[PDB]
Specification:
The structure is cut from a larger assembly and holds chains A, B, C and D. By secondary structure, chain B is mainly alpha-helical. Chain B has five helices and no strands. By secondary structure, chain C is an alpha/beta fold. The structure holds one RNA strand. It is classed as ribosome.
RNA sequence: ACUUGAAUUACUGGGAAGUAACUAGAAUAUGUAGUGUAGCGGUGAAAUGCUUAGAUAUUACAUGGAAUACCAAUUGCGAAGGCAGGUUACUACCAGUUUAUUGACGCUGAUGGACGAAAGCGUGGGGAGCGAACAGGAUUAGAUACCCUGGUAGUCCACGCCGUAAACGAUGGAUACUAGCUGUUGGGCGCAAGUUCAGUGGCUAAGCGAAAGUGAUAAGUAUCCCACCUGGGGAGUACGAACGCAAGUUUGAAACUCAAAGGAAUUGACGGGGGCCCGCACAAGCGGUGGAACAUGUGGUUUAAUUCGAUGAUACGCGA
């Protein structure tokens, strides 16, 4: 199919990953 | 090895064509880079399919 | 200091960016070397038949006036110049008796370095 | 996609009945004036009578004929005929830099066989450098 | 009660099917020794880098690590992940057929158990090449990237931990029917032709499908069981719980907002996709403009007014 539908699911899973990475070592 | 006994241009052309025939002028340009199995296994299913549709 | 008995070899090691010719005694002791980059060909023209011919002829009539008459040329590596590196030695005195090619090929030995984009 | 060429046939001159003199005066012409160009050429070749005839001029025209030109800056032969148009063009172009009095006077460069051979020497020196192509 | 389903046994075979232990060569790297002098390496071109403290190159020997060119492939095996130099030991599985044997002992399967690419985590070794992060050189207006030179973790081994992939045939497991043509793998019957089971590809009829397509190894016609779906975003998010050393995995909402998201195919348009052609389009040659002074046109600034319009190619010595 088209790639636009699979798109934005890379951004939604990258922003959460980067947020969880930047919120580590917080305690 | 490619030992070849022995004019000089005739023997040189014979050696050059034997070197081109033994499949090495393109064998090293394939080893200069790294081809992982995930990409080396599709150039077979895309070549066999072409040879089959060319029959 | 090295013996120059009249039986020797010429190792022509070429690659994708240069070529090196080495006329050597029959025991591994190098007599006279030459390179395309040595013969004032710095640039993208090191891998060219003319550069290979000039590099070969540079050492041809240098090792000639030493006592070398018969050569057993060993060719190694890909790249242009393997033709006009033996052409302009056999056409410049010293006579060739073999065109043995000893290009090394690994049997899946090491990992090639990171295919370039 | 020009698909053709005609070479533009020529006709000889009365004096010297030669076909190269016509090409020379044709390259010498300015603003479509052939009579004054012929006059200037005749005065020049008569001034050259100091030291033979136009034979020495046509042999000096040979020293300005290049055998290879650079045009990755690859060298190549030009043509069996464009040699005697590059030679004439170079001679006429470098004879207009001489700080003499008249055109027939500053055209006395055929005996300089002098800004004409320098061009051929520079062309050969620039073509022998890029010989690996 | 029976053998057709199923399972066991006997004979022929089949494989990169697993676990463990030995062993071989090519190649790369390093070290020692011999020869020898000004380069080597790299790029679209360069530079960083190694080099007269002897590099690159060549010969001989030694050390160490990882992977196995040719065979080699729409091959074969495995439930899947996956499995490739050679040898042995310990196992497992599958196919065909003259057997003999039990007699429905079968299919699926929520909770659940086991296995499960790569990356990642803990402990102890190893570390040749490659190389996240990182350090320099280069390109660029900038380049925390592509390119070049180095390089740590890692990649490897012995015990473990998580349980995630485009884990794909984007097609759950069984059984039974329904046209052919054409290869190939391992068996049986064949003196050959050829025939019959068990797997693996391609073309296509009917039939299905919105179409692309599928098509006897169905996405064809039926029956059984399991899982999943109910507009897009919010959202695999919030809260609670379980597991894990951690990274994280599994389960999983709502408030709010829009009238749309989406699949197949068609015509055009475009591409720093391909192929074939044309034009003073480019390549060659000549003469110019942009430099100077003058004439008109226009923009801009002033004036009581500086009449109006075109202000890319297709306006600016134009209407005039």
């Amino acid at each position: 199919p088209s790639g636009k539908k699979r798109k934005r699911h890379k951004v939604a899973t990258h922003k959460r990953k980067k947020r969880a990475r930047a919120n580590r070592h917080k305690k | 090895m490619l030992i070849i006994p022995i004019n000089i241009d005739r023997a040189l052309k014979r050696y050059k064509r034997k070197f081109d025939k033994t499949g090495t002028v393109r064998q090293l340009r394939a080893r200069t880079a790294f081809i992982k199995p995930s990409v080396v296994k599709r150039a077979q299913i895309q070549k066999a399919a072409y040879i089959q549709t060319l029959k | 200091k090295v013996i120059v008995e009249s039986t020797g070899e010429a190792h022509i090691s070429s690659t994708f960016n240069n070529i090196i010719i080495s006329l050597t005694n029959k025991k591994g002791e190098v007599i006279a070397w030459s390179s395309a980059g040595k013969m004032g060909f710095r640039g993208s023209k090191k891998n060219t038949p003319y550069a290979a011919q000039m590099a070969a002829e540079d050492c041809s009539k240098v090792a000639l006036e030493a006592g070398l008459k018969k050569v057993k040329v060993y060719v190694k590596g890909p790249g242009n110049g393997r033709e006009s590196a033996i052409r302009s030695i056999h056409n410049g005195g010293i006579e060739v008796t073999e065109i043995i090619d000893v290009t090394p090929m690994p049997h899946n030995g090491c990992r090639p370095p990171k295919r370039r984009r | 996609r020009k698909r053709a060429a005609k070479k533009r046939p020529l006709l000889p001159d009365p004096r010297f009945n030669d076909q190269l003199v016509t090409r020379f005066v044709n390259n010498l012409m300015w603003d479509g004036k052939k009579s004054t160009a012929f006059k200037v050429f005749y005065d020049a070749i008569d001034i050259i009578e100091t030291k033979t005839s136009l034979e020495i001029w046509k042999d000096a025209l040979t020293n300005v004929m290049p055998h290879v030109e650079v045009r990755f800056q690859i060298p190549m032969q030009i043509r069996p005929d464009r040699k005697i148009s590059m030679a004439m063009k170079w001679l006429i172009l470098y004879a207009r830099r001489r700080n003499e009095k008249s055109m027939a006077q500053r055209l006395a460069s055929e005996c300089l066989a002098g800004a004409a051979v320098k061009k051929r020497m520079d062309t050969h020196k620039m073509a022998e450098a890029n010989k690996a192509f």
